[model samples]
Structures are given as C-alpha cells and as structure tokens.
Target: MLIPAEQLPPLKEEEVIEKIENDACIQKSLEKIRALSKLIYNNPEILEQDISHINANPKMGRELSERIINSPKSIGRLKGRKIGYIKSQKYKISEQNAKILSNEIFNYADKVSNIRCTIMREHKAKGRRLLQTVKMP
Candidate 1:
C-alpha cells in the first residue's frame, strides 16, 4: 500500500539556533567544552590531574568532568594517548592542535561560533528586509 504524504517541518537558521540553545545536553556540553577549551587554551603544559580535577560548573558534575577527560565518546579533545602528548606527558594537544585549541577551543568551538554568528547575521538581515518591505508603500 502507498503511504500518505507526511508534513515536514520547515528548516530555518533560527530553528537551528533554537535547537542548539534549547537542548540542555548541547548547552551543558558546549559549556563544559568551552571551559575545557579555555583551560587547555590557557595552559601550554596541562597535566592529566589538572584535566580530570577541573572544577565543574553548577550543572556539570565531577564524574561527568572525569568522563570527558578520559573518554572520547563525548565531544572532548583527548581522544587518544598520542593526541594527549604531542611533545611530552605533561604537554597535551601539542603543535598545531595546541595552537588550534588556543585559537578557538580545538576547532569545534570555532565552527559553533561561526555557525551561530552567521545564522544570526542572516536572520537579522532577513528581518531588516522584511521591515523595509513593510515600510514601503
């Protein structure tokens, strides 16, 4: 039997932003990651102890923090031992990766930032265009 046509939701830039901002997991994950990014970004030489023992925010728990450091299942940077120590055990994400983290939280941060900014810009411009259309005779 042929299936009836199903209605699909409209996809828009604001919708994407809303999805990113509305989800608690994404928000917490972003918050957690950005914090990790900042810590790793600031410290050239980061210890495993420092990473595991980083202070968790109100919504983030200590166990979760540890999970992020040790497990690559999450969106954490420490995916492998080699990645951890590009130079030495004390140092993490060395060379270009380190520079990447310092520049923009290990690449992902930059993409997230860019997506939000670009979407917001487009949405605002669309709104301004709509206003102009409404104001015209």
Candidate 2:
C-alpha cells in the first residue's frame, strides 16, 4: 500500500494534506513515518557518511528520508498547514509539543554524530591508516 517514492509529487505544505485525504497510497506513506524514524534511529549518520557505508553495503537511510520527505500525506499533515489545528489550538501543540519534537530531531542528529565519533575512535585505535581521502575538483 505504500506509494513508491517515484510516484509521489513535490507538494507544498497545504497541498500535502489535500493529496493525503484523497490518495490511499499517500496514506500508507504517512503511516510509514514511524518505521522510517526507527530505521534512522538505528542507523544514524549524515547522508555523506551514510552513502559511504552504502557503497560498502546497502543501507537505506537516504532513500528512507527521501520517501518520508516526499510522501504527500506526511508532508501535508506537517503540523503547520491545514493541520495547523495542532498548533493554533495550543491545547494540542503545547510547549510540550515543541519540546518533544526538538528532542526527537536532536536525538536523531546526535545519533549521527555518535556514529561519526565511533568511526573516528576506530580510526584512532587502528592508527588511522584505513581512512579514505577524497579530493574535490
């Protein structure tokens, strides 16, 4: 039931909800957010480093982020558009909402940083000879 990433359209915040309401495929996409979040939490890394890991072995972080970001339903109900009810009503989007969202985003970012730190520690432990250097031309 999930919509293929290629099939989703880039939509504005408000448009995202409208499409979600009408498209079953889009609804599945929204439902996948928790799974996506779980995956990201498990494999935290910047896209560049993630790509490097993927080059060694397929890890689907980039694709997951793309699918979530591009998912019409998730994007549509993104808290501030037609779904602004969560925010404007204040009862729903209370200060706790901000704290929780901030914590989740920060936790994800921290997980990525932790991965980088682990890689660095490994490199140091191994005397750093296994590192790769790339030149930007």
Candidate 3:
C-alpha cells in the first residue's frame, strides 16, 4: 500500500527531517516506530480496517516507515544526544502517520463494526455535503 512520492504535499520531507533534528524524545522512540511501520506495510489490513490509500496517496506513510526501518545503523552511529533526537522523531512521525491512516479509513467505513455504529449514525444524521453532488429525477 505504498503511496507514490509525487502525490505528497511539498515540504513534508523537509519538515520531517527538521523535526528529527530538533527533537530528542522522538529519537528514543524509533524502534517501535520502525517496527510498526514495517508491520503496517507488510501486512496490510483488509476488511473494515483497510487503509491502503494512506500509503498509496502521497506515499509519505510508506516512505517514513522505510526511513525508520533503514535508519537504525546509520542513526545509531551518531552521538548519544543526536541519536536520541533522531529516534524520537522517527517514533513521532510513525505514530502520527499510523493514526492519520486509521482515522482516514474510519471516516469512510464507520459502520463496518458495532464499535463505530454510533459515530456513523451521527455522521449520517448530520447530512454532511457529499464531496460531489449528483442530480436525479
């Protein structure tokens, strides 16, 4: 479910790098982030939980996952403080991306499970405008 690089908004890559450089807690969290990223990418969910679009839309989700999975050795070589920051940033980014994908999918298929029935009912009741409109006789 990897996204194409061209679809991503410009500046996100630079922002991710900047966050890694500036944050320390994020560096400590990279291992979990990398692990989760790989899990998501390798075992894409089907049924109600599928969110292949997140990885396939802008490609940022998959790209971030790959970066963390590949960064351990190189990032480990850095000084202690810098390494910490890198790991922290990786974790922050990975968790954030995962949540984003989850939310996106949930928004689309809210009633697939009882857990989402209330939310889906409420959403339907609100009668939000469709992304596109059609006219019928």
Across 1-137, the per-residue lDDT of candidate 2 in tens digits comes to 76443343333434433432344542343234333433333212323353333223323434444444444233223332234444444333333333343334334433444444454455354443323335469
Ranking by TM-score: 1, 2, 3
In candidate 1, the residue pairs with backbone N, CA or C atoms under 3 Å apart (3 or more residues apart, or in different chains) clash, namely: none
Best by TM-score: 1
* Model 2 alpha-carbon drift over 4 Å, by segment: 1-75, 78-99, 128-137
Residue 76 in candidate 2 has what lDDT? Answer: 24
Q: Per-residue alpha-carbon lDDT of model 3 for 1-137, expressed as tens digits?
A: 75444333344434433433344443333333344435434323221112223212324434433543455332222212224345555455544555544444333222122323333454444343332346568
lDDT of 2 at 88: 48
Q: How well does candidate 2 score on lDDT at residue 1?
A: 71
lDDT of candidates 1 onward, in order: 0.42, 0.37, 0.37
> Best by lDDT, which number?
1
